Amino acid sequence: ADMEVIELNKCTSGQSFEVILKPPSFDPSLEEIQKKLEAAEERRKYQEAELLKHLAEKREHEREVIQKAIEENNNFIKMAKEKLAQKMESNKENREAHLAAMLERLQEKDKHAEEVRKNKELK
Amino acid sequence: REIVHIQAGQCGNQIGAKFWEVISDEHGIDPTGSYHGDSDLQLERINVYYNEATGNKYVPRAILVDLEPGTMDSVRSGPFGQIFRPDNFVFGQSGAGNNWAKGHYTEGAELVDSVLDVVRKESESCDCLQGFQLTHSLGGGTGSGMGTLLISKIREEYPDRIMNTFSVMPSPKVSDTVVEPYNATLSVHQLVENTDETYSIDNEALYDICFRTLKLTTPTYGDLNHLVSATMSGVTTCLRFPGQLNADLRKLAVNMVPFPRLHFFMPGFAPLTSRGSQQYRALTVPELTQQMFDSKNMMAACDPRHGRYLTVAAVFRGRMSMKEVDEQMLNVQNKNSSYFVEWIPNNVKTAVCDIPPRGLKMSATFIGNSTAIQELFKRISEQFTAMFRRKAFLHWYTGEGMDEMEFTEAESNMNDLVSEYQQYQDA
Amino acid sequence: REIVHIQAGQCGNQIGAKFWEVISDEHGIDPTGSYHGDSDLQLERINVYYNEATGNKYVPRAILVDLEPGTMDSVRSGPFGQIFRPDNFVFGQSGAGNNWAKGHYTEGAELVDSVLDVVRKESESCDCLQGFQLTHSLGGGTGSGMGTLLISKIREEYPDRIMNTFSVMPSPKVSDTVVEPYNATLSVHQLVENTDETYSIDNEALYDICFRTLKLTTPTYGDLNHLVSATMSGVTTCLRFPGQLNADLRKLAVNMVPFPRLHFFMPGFAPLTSLTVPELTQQMFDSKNMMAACDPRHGRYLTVAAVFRGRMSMKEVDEQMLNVQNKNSSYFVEWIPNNVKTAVCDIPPRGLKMSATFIGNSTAIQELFKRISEQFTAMFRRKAFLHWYTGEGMDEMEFTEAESNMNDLVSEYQQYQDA
Amino acid sequence: RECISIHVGQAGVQIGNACWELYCLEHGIQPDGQMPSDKTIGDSFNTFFSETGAGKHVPRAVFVDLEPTVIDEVRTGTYRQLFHPEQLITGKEDAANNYARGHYTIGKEIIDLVLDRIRKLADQCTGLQGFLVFHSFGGGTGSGFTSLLMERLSVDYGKKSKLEFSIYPAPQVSTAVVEPYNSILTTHTTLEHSDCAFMVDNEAIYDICRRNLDIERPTYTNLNRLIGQIVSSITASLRFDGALNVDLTEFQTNLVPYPRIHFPLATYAPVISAEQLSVAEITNACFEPANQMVKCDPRHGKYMACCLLYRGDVVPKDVNAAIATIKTKRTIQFVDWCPTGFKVGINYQPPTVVPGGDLAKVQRAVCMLSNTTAIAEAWARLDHKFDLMYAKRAFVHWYVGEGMEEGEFSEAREDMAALEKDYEEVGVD
Amino acid sequence: RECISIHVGQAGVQIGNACWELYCLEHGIQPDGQMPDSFNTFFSETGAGKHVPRAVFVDLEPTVIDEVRTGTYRQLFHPEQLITGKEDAANNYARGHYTIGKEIIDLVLDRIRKLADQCTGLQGFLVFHSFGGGTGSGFTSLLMERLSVDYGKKSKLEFSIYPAPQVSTAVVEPYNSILTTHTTLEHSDCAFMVDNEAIYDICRRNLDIERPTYTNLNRLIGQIVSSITASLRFDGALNVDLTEFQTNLVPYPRIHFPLATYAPVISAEKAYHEQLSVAEITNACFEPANQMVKCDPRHGKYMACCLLYRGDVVPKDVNAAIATIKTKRTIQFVDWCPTGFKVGINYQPPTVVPGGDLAKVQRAVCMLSNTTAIAEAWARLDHKFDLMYAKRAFVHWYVGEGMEEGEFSEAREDMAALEKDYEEVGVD
Ligand SMILES: Nc1nc2c(ncn2[C@@H]2O[C@H](COP(=O)(O)OP(=O)(O)OP(=O)(O)O)[C@@H](O)[C@H]2O)c(=O)[nH]1
Ligand SMILES: Nc1nc2c(ncn2[C@@H]2O[C@H](COP(=O)(O)OP(=O)(O)OP(=O)(O)O)[C@@H](O)[C@H]2O)c(=O)[nH]1
Ligand SMILES: Nc1nc2c(ncn2[C@@H]2O[C@H](COP(=O)(O)OP(=O)(O)O)[C@@H](O)[C@H]2O)c(=O)[nH]1
Ligand SMILES: Nc1nc2c(ncn2[C@@H]2O[C@H](COP(=O)(O)OP(=O)(O)O)[C@@H](O)[C@H]2O)c(=O)[nH]1
Ligand SMILES: CCOC(=O)Nc1cc2c(c(N)n1)N=C(c1ccccc1)[C@@H](C)N2
Ligand SMILES: CCOC(=O)Nc1cc2c(c(N)n1)N=C(c1ccccc1)[C@@H](C)N2
Ligand SMILES: [Mg+2]
Ligand SMILES: [Mg+2]
Known about the structure:
B: Rossmann fold; CATH 3.30.1330.20; six-stranded parallel β-sheet; D: alpha/beta; Rossmann fold; Helix Hairpins; 3 domains; binds magnesium ion
């Protein structure tokens, strides 16, 4: 706009200068936070120590499954080891006095046949 | 697996003889020695009926009991005489009486132990003894009375193994003794509690089969034993022959008896006669089936009409095709469908062995748990208490060492068995 | 920086084999020895997939798990056989069952510790282990059940490092076991909480890509693996090749997953079997060429990566890349801004002058979960074949505990059709 | 890995002898045990045989019966060379067509010995799998010893599964009336100790021969050759190693959805008599009530798990479109809640038949293992006999006799009633 | 007096390496350090032969720092002055600031303190770093917090690389910029943003480069930076010392961000056309094309304006040239501050990188404007950030490494309030 320069300095390898054109027209850093950076680590250290206290969780549940299975299995063997031999010693006991129940009928057609000749040798 | 044979009494023994010589033919044995025959089967299952001794030799597993010499030296002097091991004969000496008690109590028990002493041998010798069978009369003491004892003493010693008899139910027509009813009722009692199966054989039948069905005028104890002889081969075959069954005798019973009492098979046969009559080859299968299922061809006098078959086995003989057999067998279960029980399902099984009997190209034998057997029992108890009226002949047992109520005590045990078969006219 | 590889299960393993020999070609390695090829690049980033041993030698960083000999002596007897270090093989002996529980609980945990023992000593050997990747089936136990276990035991030991899988989601058509739905739903749960990215791969797709798209009548497990083999080379390349990316694997994940569940990239490929740029592009963005059985139509793209291959002018590449994002502008989300980035490495694959691969985080993946969960509840219904796991020591409701975890992951993908 | 065959009972034994025979043809073993194929030191068929000594190839089997007789014919006709004299236990006295005898009376005595002679064979096995128990349904030792075996095997062997092949009994070629009791007895004690169980209806086999083989009235060894063929097509998967069905679990993980429901229905493909069929046509035979293996009708019961076991010259490229028009022509028939099946098992090994046998050499054969609810038809067709007898105590007293309980009968019929119920309880929604 | 350069982050480092290179050309130092007051403003006369840069280079991978101890220049630094750190920041601020930062910061901070100790009256620091992107945002932020504590008055000038969709790879970018820029801004003094897009743009129009490289872009930024730092390396009046940077450029504590514009970018291949007139180049500075951050200052008000000339120029020319920038183009000044133009002449003709892309020019111009239209890119950013955080988008990676859901809220908060100051400077 054709202006006048306010010459502001000259030295070895240069020259500065303002060129005002049309008047202007009248119109705490803080150190304490090194404890903020181990506040951040306050919550990391918590998170990973929880997908651990929740993971060492899904763990000794595996202990169960793995064994609360085997422990339900032999639960069947030692149910069915006597669902056998206590069904089967109820059997040996059952027949044997159904043999006797046959034989003690014989001693009875027998110790009567005896007493009916001791009655012939008396008639 | 192995079976022994007790054969006691004049009637029991003269059956036994003919039986033995007929089956001895089928396997082919010299009156003494060993095998003579172009067949080769025979000997698979000769094991079962013949304990074999040194040299060549084959000797039956037989015990012959009688309470008097007479009828034992009949066998030894007759047909297949000296075939039986000498001291397998248990002699009698004494009376027989034709009286149950003498044979079951006094003169019987007098022997008995000596019989038990042969059986105990043969059976204890026998490598896997399966069971015994016995033959005898039921009216008359030495058979009916000794045997019913034998069996009672046979069990108890052998609970274990299965028992089995061809017993001869006596008729008012064609018999010797007024008393037989008394005799029978007493053994019938005995049997129904100590045997596992009991082939019923009426002499009423046996005689009737010869005059109604043979024209045979003077029927002996000869031609008449002849039938029983045959019928008995019939029944036995499949424990002694093929390998198309396998016939455990136990299996055989379990599959024949529903109810532990009532093991009273009335038997029957295919063809017949011996002397002046033949068969012009024509035993055809069909005419062989509605023949073994004809009552006028039953070995007990009943009539498997009134009274229904509980179970029924049949076994066929001869190189004939069974592709017809099941198909005739079928047919009769429709042609007479009414008179099988339904409540035991597949209750008539039939099998075939194919090496014919003496003579006869094709033949059939029928085993038969018919509650029409009630017919037989109810006939004998009909003349029994017609005797126990004001207690007639009874006095022979009165003193022999028997009791008042003991007759009645078996009059009753029968009268139950009667109304138990009528109880199985079921639903 | 360095990555190890776990390859477990008959399906997991026969994939792993094909993968390895294909990438082993790209770098050029003798069935045993070392480099043979006129190229020179290869070896910059061969560091990453190959721990090298004495003599000449190169040996993969590989662990092979199975719960029975059978399919391991298939690799050792087959193509690039005796390439993997002898005792990097973890044998099974026992049953596998085609049953999740046996592999995740009983016969699995029985081993496991021996596997952990190889990994621990490859990874601890490894100078800066960046992460592991795993391959395996999802319907059938030794893979889906052992692996889901492996990865659970792999984290916890290595929280730290990032996990990653090519998992093969099974189909009702072309499969062996009635039960697979049960198997999958059980691992889907597992994965969605323990992996950082998971390449979904339908056999429904794999097969379909062969009969609608290849005139191949009797599709093997051979020519069908072939695809995954390829698609897997595609995905990996830029952690293993140029230096125009640099692809931390972590960086790679952070820039691919918005929300910590839902890392379910359906992939895709350019050409097919035993190519111009435009016609390469509008083919990798076609469904008829996706690796999950989806249709990236009903469901919008979350984030999307494509990797291009072949000395070609890429000035054409983004000029076609932009084009898809306008001729298909509706179908990517707005609320993540520059959410479809691509990169180009120029060393082509086995044969094939030009090629491209598409990793795609698409909510249309919900379509695949729904489809399994649909035949899963229809089975857990009157509590069907469940009895094979009943007595294996698993819980009645432990199924329903994963059945629901899934139905969430469905209606989250659905909850990201938002505004 | 390994795999032991037990055959108890006259029927079991002969089915056995007639398929160890057919195994032997299939794997090329001359009777004496030696085979001139390079497949022995001690893989492939080692599932069943053991490479014992330096020459022979003994079957991993044990044979038990309570008579000799049947076991006796093995130590008789060539094959006499094939087993170890140990592996065939015989037992003096018979079981007599009676379970009580088999389980309690005569069993007690021999079981200790058998159980241990099995334990010999399991000890020459690094990782044994399971047992195959062949046995007759009805009939004595077959029902009763089998039952006792399984109780015990269940105790002496943990996981180790058990597959039974039962011979469901048939009026026409039986002899035994008491049959039904025996089957409903065993089947009750037996079923919680079993894993999956192939019934074989004698009647249906007798049937096949009378229609398909032109045999007038067919023998036992007629029937056995047929069953021999069927079993060998089932076991086929684990003997040559199949491209599916390759272990006992995932063989059957396939077949039994519910613990109780074991009983799959089998159907053998081309039974055709010497003195060829299309891949399509044979598949379209499997679904024909005639060619079935248990007399029933699955066109009206629902299917709930379906296998197809092919054997011979087949490209899957065929199997498929053949199945396709099994669904657009015939009766689909699927349950409320399980896919629509068809695990398909290809084995390239062409089927061998017995040399002067009844059937001919076939190019391709199919096998279809279906778990349909219509196989409970024969669960009642049995029951009804049992009911209509026990109603009168019929044959009971033979059992109470050997030692059994009046109430143990009640109790077994109680089980079928409840089973017959589960099977009805799987239809629709 | 003295003056230390810090370059954190892949981007920082390479911008660095490509302008230490250009410094080296300008002051005549052969790579080895030896060259056969003044420019001691940047280098130190260490030992008897060499001329080590007063710099420190930090990154969290090796890789990039590794390239330097490789290609000649390898001779130029002290092995100490390049800190590398094993594991990556992974495109994520949290990681850079809190997780992976913590560990290395105590070391760097001290290795800087070595360089400040061989200096009698140190001035301030120049921090080169990428805006978006991991270590660049995150470590920088932590650096500045700490440099602010360890160094009193001593001012800090930052050169940020405002990130651009076409040549980036990262989606999560925006978050990282808005994050740092928040913690960073109360610890900074004046800050030159550099819009990759705008540079990518210059090359595509002005250099004929089809799809330009990073090392393409860097040579350009190298040139611009070296025209800014120029004042304090040769010493010519105006910007003798860092203090003055702000005194001329920042009227308000917050408003740091000046807009740069480099003059004659023209490609050898055109290197012999009758070169450009003192007038015409000035008349380029005011061209949205030749800008340094993509926006439009023809509509935003200017509030402080510098022209930094370099080469053969008599001020006589400059003037009447400016005169008809007024009577032709858009004046555009704020309510209350003169009408600018503090003009800087430096006689040192501008040197270019030898087999580079641009040519040896006789005269070049540099225009440093503090316009309120540079807040256009403050929003073009924000909007991305907004439209993501709205869905939590990528957040969980952060909460993950250790951060606060609410620390995000709080940074957008700052931009919101800034974007406001920047609007609040128009008229009255
Ligand atoms: N399919 C078939 N069934 C048979 C065979 N042999 C016998 N049976 C049947 O076997 C069933 C009875 O079982 P068995 O083995 O015969 O009798 P077991 O008591 O177990 O054996 P035994 O010692 O002979 O009594 C009946 O249904 C007969 O039909 C055979 O070879 N094949
Ligand atoms: N101008 C320029 N920008 C770059 C350069 N390298 C990366 N960027 C940009 O920087 C942003 C990513 O910043 P980076 O420096 O790569 O991230 P960083 O964590 O600082 O570097 P890393 O150590 O690799 O993580 C993206 O906008 C890139 O476009 C470069 O060499 N020059
Ligand atoms: N069929 C057959 N029955 C006979 C024979 N002899 C007699 N009986 C019948 O059976 C009854 C009893 O036989 P018997 O031998 O006299 O009895 P014993 O005292 O044991 O000799 C006889 O009274 C006849 O009814 C015989 O030769 N064969
Ligand atoms: N593509 C691919 N999938 C397979 C392969 N083999 C089996 N599958 C599939 O994976 C699922 C079962 O995996 P499988 O390998 O049998 O289980 P695993 O051995 O216990 O891992 C089924 O749905 C099959 O369709 C194969 O080798 N390649
Ligand atoms: C001393 C001889 O043994 C006897 O006294 N009596 C005996 C004879 C039988 C019989 C059975 N139960 N008891 N059953 C048979 C049967 C008929 C058809 C199919 C199966 C078997 C045939 C063999 N004959
Ligand atoms: C185990 C091997 O690799 C993975 O598991 N996961 C993986 C691989 C990627 C990938 C990504 N996100 N995840 N992204 C890529 C990419 C494409 C465009 C821009 C940035 C990256 C290409 C290089 N490959
Ligand atoms: Mg498998
Ligand atoms: Mg038996």
